[PDB]
């Protein structure tokens, strides 16, 4: 089998991607971030607090013929920017561009954190990294992919972001068609539960290419690229005006500046990051400073190769019995 969905920018930043799944019967079609460095599925739902609600599309277990409680189980998940939620279990059958599995996990929230209230476009998320990180107990879940894997045609799912533009999520085949040239494999390791790969080097602009590890994780729930600050501090160093704000969080730039572009090195191969794909904007409607796509990793304890990094290329995440992780030029 296979599946292949579009995942559509919530908003003019891409700030985050939402792609519709299906869940139940009928089904119920919520907008879910897709998120490779995580490994629930969890939904806005008719158990979740109503006051932190407020405009996302509710799954309803009750409303299912196919829905069943997973009896005992509970979750509660805290991500990298602080955000949280938890709830109870059910298991349902789940769809994704066509792609059904049976039985997956549909984690119900109870409680979300005020991040989660305030974007109204997001009715959840869909996790893609390892069933290691799942946190339901006791009885930890498998990921959607981890379910499907099977029945695919190849083990695989790709990420194909768009930049200020819709893109797609395939699950069981490589669509030959959606990238240039040839695809550059590279190793994973699993330790962490993440997409984790290490990436041979950068570039700034038209500079020389530096030879040099990066160890970090491909990871489409992150709007951002966070690299070392030796690495942040070279690509800022080239626009006239940009420092770190310590009171913004961050890298900010004179929004009149043209950004230069970043490279970083998938083996031998090079994916060029361009430099519009690096301006966030201004940092308070109507301010001329604009916040920095590329930010340091030193406050987080790993590099994180985010949308801005990932919507540069076609990217393979590669389930086969070892993992490995493919990049093509787009």
Aim: hydrophobic share 35%.
């Amino acid at each position: 089998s296979t599946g292949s969905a579009t995942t559509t920018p919530i908003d003019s930043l891409d700030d985050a991607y939402i792609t519709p799944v299906q869940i139940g019967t009928p089904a119920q079609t919520l907008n879910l971030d897709f998120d490779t460095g995580s490994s629930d599925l969890w939904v806005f739902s008719s158990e979740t607090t109503a006051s932190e609600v407020d405009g996302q599309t509710i799954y309803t277990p009750s409303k299912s013929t196919t829905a069943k409680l997973l009896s005992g189980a509970t979750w509660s998940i805290s991500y990298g920017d602080g955000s949280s939620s938890s709830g109870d279990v059910y298991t349902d059958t789940v769809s994704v561009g066509g792609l059904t599995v049976t039985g997956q996990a549909v984690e119900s929230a109870k409680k979300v954190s005020s991040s989660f209230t305030e974007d109204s476009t997001i009715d959840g998320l869909l996790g893609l990294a390892f069933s290691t990180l799942n946190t339901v107990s006791p009885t930890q879940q498998k990921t959607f992919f981890d379910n499907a894997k099977a029945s695919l045609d190849s083990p695989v799912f790709t990420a194909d972001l768009g930049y200020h533009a819709p893109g797609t999520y395939n699950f069981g085949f490589i669509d030959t068609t959606a990238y240039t040239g040839s695809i550059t494999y590279t190793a994973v390791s699993t330790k962490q539960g993440f997409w984790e790969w290490t990436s041979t080097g950068y570039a700034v602009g038209s500079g020389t290419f530096k030879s040099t590890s990066i160890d970090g994780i491909a990871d489409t729930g992150t709007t951002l690229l966070y690299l070392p600050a030796t690495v942040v501090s070279a690509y800022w160093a080239q626009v006239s005006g940009a420092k770190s704000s310590s009171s913004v969080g961050g890298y900010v730039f004179p929004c009149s500046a043209t950004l230069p572009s970043f490279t970083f090195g998938v083996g031998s191969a090079r994916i060029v990051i361009p430099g519009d794909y690096i301006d966030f904007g201004p940092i308070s409607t109507g301010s001329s400073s604009c916040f920095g796509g590329i930010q340091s990793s030193a406050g987080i304890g790993i590099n994180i190769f985010g949308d801005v990094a990932l919507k540069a290329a076609f990217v393979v995440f590669n389930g086969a019995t070892t993992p490995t992780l493919g990049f093509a030029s787009k």
